[PDB]
Amino acid sequence: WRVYSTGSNVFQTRAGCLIGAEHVNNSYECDIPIGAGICASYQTSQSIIAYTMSLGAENSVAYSNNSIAIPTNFTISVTTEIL
Amino acid sequence: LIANQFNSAIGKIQDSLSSTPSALGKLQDVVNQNAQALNTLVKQLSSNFGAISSVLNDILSRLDPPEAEVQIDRLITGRLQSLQTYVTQQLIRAAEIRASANLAATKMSECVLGQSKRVDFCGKGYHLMSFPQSAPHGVVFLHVTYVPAQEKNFTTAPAICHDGKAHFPREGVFVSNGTHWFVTQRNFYEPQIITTDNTFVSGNCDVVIGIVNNTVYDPLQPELD
Amino acid sequence: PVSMTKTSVDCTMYICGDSTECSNLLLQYGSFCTQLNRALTGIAVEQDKNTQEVFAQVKQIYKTPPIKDFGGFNFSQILPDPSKPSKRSPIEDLLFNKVTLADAGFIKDLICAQKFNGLTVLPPLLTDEMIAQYTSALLAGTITSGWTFGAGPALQIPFPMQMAYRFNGIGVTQNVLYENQKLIANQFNSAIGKIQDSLSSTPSALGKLQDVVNQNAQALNTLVKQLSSNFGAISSVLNDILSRLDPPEAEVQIDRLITGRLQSLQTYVTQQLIRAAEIRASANLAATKMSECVLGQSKRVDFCGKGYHLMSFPQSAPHGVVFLHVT
Ligand SMILES: *[C@@H]1O[C@H](CO)[C@@H](O[C@@H]2O[C@H](CO)[C@@H](O)[C@H](O)[C@H]2NC(C)=O)[C@H](O)[C@H]1NC(C)=O
Ligand SMILES: *[C@@H]1O[C@H](CO)[C@@H](O[C@@H]2O[C@H](CO)[C@@H](O)[C@H](O)[C@H]2NC(C)=O)[C@H](O)[C@H]1NC(C)=O
Ligand SMILES: *[C@@H]1O[C@H](CO)[C@@H](O[C@@H]2O[C@H](CO)[C@@H](O)[C@H](O)[C@H]2NC(C)=O)[C@H](O)[C@H]1NC(C)=O
Ligand SMILES: *[C@@H]1O[C@H](CO)[C@@H](O)[C@H](O)[C@H]1NC(C)=O
Ligand SMILES: *[C@@H]1O[C@H](CO)[C@@H](O)[C@H](O)[C@H]1NC(C)=O
């Protein structure tokens, strides 16, 4: 089959050669694992995109040598677990 | 407040299981794999293995014994190899399921019949209790946990120098509104006046670094004077 | 150990390497090769599941502040170093240089000789640069928030006050720490430096990792060597049997070669399944230690090092994890 190899959106990953998926500059959470930190998903007029997966949101804790944070309110949370 | 939060959370569990269809995949996959194995085994009956036909009675109804033996031996070799493959993979899968059942027994003994202090063993947060429910070939735990969330900042100090003595909290921590000093337990903000009954004395106040100067109210002195 | 090397084997290039007649003889055996590819693909997925289960405990990436007044404690041998191309701690650098890794498997030796007979190595899903980012997030959360970042929102606290809480956990009254802060700081720094030197000197330290790598390579090695056996045929080269004999007599030889090579593949796949079960048990133990020793304080005896446990720090290693238990 050769009707995909025309391409014009070829991409080179450390796992190999990806044809038929456009590369973005964003970073999302992983949907379909490809490898070497590259995942791919189906999003926007809809297409298949390949990106570098994002570990999570960046956070910075305001550390200091005389400062503490204490809660004031609480939440009762019920989660499930299937075995 | 806690009654309303608990009832509401159980209702959200109800709706989340009622709507999301891919929740029980850990059970479902198990069933799928078993059926898949049996399926492959059945269609191994249709392979020739090098014989004239995959139907045994067609070898019997056509050939005389001194070569029907030769073809039947080939068929027997192939089918016996298929059975040994199936039995080995069933043994390994049974080992995995036994490990999962031992983990489920441990969670039943520790999360349900008692209260656990292992972190992230019985859900996320500080564990309060658990309830089991049955599922087809499996178990489902509902872990009820405590998660604290609305925080403020305060400025602390490890000790209080009062009269050349260092006072330490019996339980809690010293905090500041900005102007005064209070004693607070470590997971819920409720300030109290620093008395003698919730602090203990240990040594003088020239050794601890970062000690702040304050006063400690004694409950006996306004009783006498 | 946490994971092993993801390996894929193609039957038809292994058994009937580049032949049409051998493929037609192999189709009479049914669906062995679909079964083998399913088993090896299951192992290859489970490896990434192991690594994701161990390291991805939190879903925010904390960062340590640039100021480093931790009351006298000095975490410089475990915190990441910005003056390197890969942002790693120097203990992680020693751990990367100790293991003589083989079968790297990126895009391009003995690895090529394995590669030309249908044996491939897949790359892992998480690189070595993101596992270091999870490790740095775990240390930043531990030294700036205590245990509370694994149970809700991260709440900052001064470090010697956290360490006083940790003495109060094991039955020692907290005035012991505040009257001996300099002594504990010096003992902690000296112990970390001795860990550095002892790991830098002893060469047989990481055998638990190394053995895993060795065993996998050994299995692949003997699989390749099974291509050189006759199994009762006139040659071990399929093209010679094809280039000499007529089809109705060469079919008998080729069937014998197919039987032997298929038995070799089934032996290799069975032993890989059992080793994958062993590594998964070890990865579940590593996940339990990460949840209970690092994200909290344990009271189980000898679970998190020998003595009364105070706290722990994780570091990455090639296909594994290294805990430092402070006790
Ligand atoms: C603690 O949090 C709870 C919710 O988690 C607060 O309860 C809500 O209070 C508002 C008042 O503005 C009501 O409108 C809501 O109906 C309440 N929710 C529930 C579930 O009852 C509570 O007020 C908070 N308390 C403090 C002191 O902050
Ligand atoms: C420090 O905490 C005290 C708690 O008493 C706060 O002082 C009170 O302020 C109210 C007015 O808002 C007065 O009516 C009370 O008499 C005060 N208490 C005392 C003992 O004098 C004070 O607001 C807090 N500091 C800050 C900056 O909020
Ligand atoms: C934390 O410990 C490190 C140990 O590596 C200290 O770094 C050393 O500091 C001495 C003092 O001048 C130097 O002679 C060494 O060359 C340093 N070694 C390295 C590898 O940098 C570091 O100073 C300590 N932290 C603080 C804040 O003092
Ligand atoms: C913490 O509270 C102090 C007030 O004491 C404030 O100055 C500071 O900005 C707060 N930090 C954060 C991160 O909220
Ligand atoms: C915290 O650090 C500051 C440095 O600006 C110092 O002045 C202060 O004494 C320190 N506090 C404690 C409790 O060590």
Numbering used by the authors:
A (entry chain B): 633 to 676, 689 to 727
B (entry chain B): 922 to 1146
C (entry chain C): 728 to 835, 848 to 1066
Give the original sentences from the paper that presented this experimental model.
SARS-CoV-2 spike protein plays a key role in mediating viral entry and inducing host immune responses. It can adopt either an open or closed conformation based on the position of its receptor-binding domain (RBD). On newly packaged virus particles, the trimeric spike protein has a pre-fusion structure in which three receptor-binding S1 subunits sit on top of a trimeric membrane-fusion S2 stalk. During viral entry, a receptor-binding domain (RBD) in S1 binds to a receptor on host cell surface for viral attachment and S2 switches to a post-fusion structure for the fusion of viral and host membranes.
We identified residue 417 as potentially a key difference between the two spikes: in the closed SARS-CoV-2 trimeric spike, Lys417 in the RBD from one spike subunit forms a hydrogen bond with the main chain of Asn370 in the RBD from another spike subunit, stabilizing the RBDs in the closed conformation. To this end, we introduced the K417V mutation into SARS-CoV-2 spike ectodomain and purified both versions of the protein: K417-spike containing Lys417 and V417-spike containing Val417. To stabilize the recombinant spike ectodomain, we introduced six proline mutations into its S2 subunit to lock up its pre-fusion structure, introduced mutations to its furin motif to prevent it from being cleaved during molecular maturation, and added a C-terminal foldon tag to facilitate its trimerization. For the K417-spike, 55% of the molecules were in the closed conformation with all three RBDs down, whereas the rest of the molecules (45%) were in the open conformation with one RBD up and two RBDs down. Further 3D refinements using the good particles generated a 3.2 Å map for the closed spike and a 3.9 Å map for the open spike. Lys417 in the closed SARS-CoV-2 spike forms a hydrogen bond with another spike subunit, stabilizing the closed spike. To summarize, Lys417 in SARS-CoV-2 spike aids in keeping the spike closed, potentially hindering ACE2 binding and viral entry, but providing an edge in immune evasion. Overall, these epitope-based analyses reveal that SARS-CoV-2 spike in the closed conformation can evade significant amounts of neutralizing antibodies, confirming our previous hypothesis that the closed conformation of the spike is a viral strategy for immune evasion.
